Design a protein around this ligand. Structure first.
Ligand SMILES: Cn1cnc2nc(N)[nH]c(=O)c21
Length: 231
DNA sequence: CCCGAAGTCCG
DNA sequence: CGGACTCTCGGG
């Protein structure tokens, strides 16, 4: 069975605007885990828009099919476009899509794709269905996959006043001993971001619980100005 | 326009 | 370790 024609059209149009000179630094920035065509986001978005204008967005029955097919293409721009396309189907994504989203997190994994899946798509699902958190988060923390561990940390990133503080700190406690940069940094990020809503709670947590040095420093990068740096 | 959110390079 | 800095991207 051939590639979906929308994907074939997108592949043709992206490839015709590839930039091998830019592709080399773009691939190096992702530590050469991926081939790149060399197309940056403003142009990539317009090229996708060109294809939607010509072909129309596929019927929602094909949404997951399109995403998978783009995920399986070698160049990283096709995963970025896949995430752009998934946003166009946002109103059709619900709690039944958590396994589909998990599979995207653990395939072609790196911070660029995972961070575009977790605080937005999964974050919105678990805000609406917080009773489903315990069906996934414990497994993610226990898994060998650092990107599911990062998902457990960052899905609440944007929750602000809806943050479940007890849950957040329990998750961080489970992962505070990790030597993985992407876990230590995710802990620092979510704490730094939540400190924009509740600085006192974050300050108390980082002063009284063990964290990797990187995590602590990133957490208080801004709020240390409010409290001071004791001699 | 601005600001705040991986990477290199150095001590 | 962490400071100083780069570029790209999203949002105000
Ligand atoms: C702070 N920060 C986090 N991710 C970032 N990505 C880029 N490209 N540039 C930054 O300054 C940056």
């Amino acid at each position: 069975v051939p590639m979906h024609p929308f994907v074939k059209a997108l592949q043709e149009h992206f490839t015709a605007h590839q930039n091998p000179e830019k592709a080399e630094p773009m691939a190096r920035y992702m530590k050469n885990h991926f081939l790149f065509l060399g197309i940056q986001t403003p142009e990539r978005r317009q090229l996708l828009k060109d294809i939607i204008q010509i072909h129309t967005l596929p019927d929602q029955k094909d949404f997951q099919i399109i995403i998978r097919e783009l995920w399986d293409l070698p160049e990283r721009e096709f995963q970025a476009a896949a995430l752009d396309i998934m946003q166009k189907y946002k109103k059709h994504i619900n709690e039944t899509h958590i396994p589909f989203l998990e599979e995207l997190i653990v395939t072609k994994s790196w911070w660029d794709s995972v961070d575009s899946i977790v605080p937005t798509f999964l974050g919105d699902i678990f805000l609406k269905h917080p009773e489903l958190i315990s069906a996934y988060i414990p497994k993610w923390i226990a898994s060998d996959n650092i990107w599911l561990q990062r998902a457990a940390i960052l899905f609440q990133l944007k929750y602000k006043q809806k943050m479940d503080e007890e849950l957040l700190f329990w998750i961080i406690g489970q992962l505070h001993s990790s030597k993985e940069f992407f876990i230590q940094k995710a802990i620092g990020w979510v704490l730094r971001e939540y400190a924009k809503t509740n600085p006192d709670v974050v300050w108390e947590y980082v002063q009284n619980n063990e964290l990797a040095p990187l995590s602590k420093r990133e957490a208080i990068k801004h709020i240390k100005q409010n409290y001071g740096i004791n001699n």
